[PDB]
Amino acid sequence: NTLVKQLSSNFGAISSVLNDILSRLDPPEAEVQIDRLITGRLQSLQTYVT
Amino acid sequence: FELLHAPATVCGPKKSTNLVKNKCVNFNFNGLTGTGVLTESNKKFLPFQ
Amino acid sequence: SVLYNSASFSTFKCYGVSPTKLNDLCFTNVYADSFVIRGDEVRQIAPGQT
């Protein structure tokens, strides 16, 4: 349950829905927004596996 | 502008399309995108949600 | 999209959304404000500026 709850966090981005970012922005400005969220989710998964 | 605040009523001229269900299809509801299977719902909503 | 180039405005910049993507999203309670300012003060109207 704790792992699943992590999908509802901004992680410093402007929204927590990837489709929203892909829909309301262009790639050149969506790059960093996707990058930060990817980093956060990867860290959470690493902790769970450990 | 403000996004996802109410039952939106103002946006650009994109033509609607015939409704289909019970198949793995894409969808686009007031800028809400995604894919999945649509089916009839037994839930009930308050008349403002 | 038609307004984006109908009058060829001198300055046209969008924050939080791409100008070419305004033809798909659906909004609520669109506001509009207008004024007249000198040329120098235009660069100081962007949010986050002093």
UniProtKB/Swiss-Prot annotation, chain A:
It comes from Severe acute respiratory syndrome coronavirus 2. It comes from the Viruses. Subunit of the fusion protein that is processed upon entry into the host cell. Mediates fusion of the virion and cellular membranes by functioning as a class I viral fusion protein. Contains a viral fusion peptide that is unmasked after S2 cleavage. This cleavage can occur at the cell membrane by host TMPRSS2 or during endocytosis by host CSTL. In either case, this triggers an extensive and irreversible conformational change that leads to fusion of the viral envelope with the cellular cytoplasmic membrane, releasing viral genomic RNA into the host cell cytoplasm. Changing residue 23 to A: In strain: Alpha/B.1.1.7. This is Spike protein S2'. Residues 1-34 form a coiled coil.
Swiss-Prot record, chain C:
Residues 38-40 are annotated as: Integrin-binding motif. It comes from the Viruses. Changing residue 11 to A: In strain: Omicron/BA.2, Omicron/BA.2.12.1, Omicron/BA.4, Omicron/BA.5, Omicron/BQ.1.1, Omicron/XBB.1.5, Omicron/EG.5.1. Changing residue 6 to F: In strain: Omicron/BA.2, Omicron/BA.2.12.1, Omicron/BA.2.75, Omicron/BA.4, Omicron/BA.5, Omicron/BQ.1.1, Omicron/XBB.1.5, Omicron/EG.5.1. Binds to host ACE2. RBD also interacts with the N-linked glycan on 'Asn-90' of ACE2. Cleavage of S generates a polybasic C-terminal sequence on S1 that binds to host Neuropilin-1 (NRP1) and Neuropilin-2 (NRP2) receptors. Interacts with host integrin alpha-5/beta-1 (ITGA5:ITGB1) and with ACE2 in complex with integrin alpha-5/beta-1 (ITGA5:ITGB1). May interact via cytoplasmic c-terminus with M protein. May interact (via N-terminus) with host bilirubin and biliverdin, thereby preventing antibody binding to the SARS-CoV-2 spike NTD via an allosteric mechanism. Attaches the virion to the cell membrane by interacting with host receptor, initiating the infection. The major receptor is host ACE2. When S2/S2' has been cleaved, binding to the receptor triggers direct fusion at the cell membrane. When S2/S2' has not been cleaved, binding to the receptor results in internalization of the virus by endocytosis using host TFRC and GRM2 and leading to fusion of the virion membrane with the host endosomal membrane. Alternatively, may use NRP1/NRP2 and integrin as entry receptors. This is Spike protein S1. It comes from Severe acute respiratory syndrome coronavirus 2 (2019-nCoV). The lineage of its organism: Viruses, Riboviria, Orthornavirae, Pisuviricota, Pisoniviricetes. The chain holds residues 366 to 415 of 1273 of the full protein.
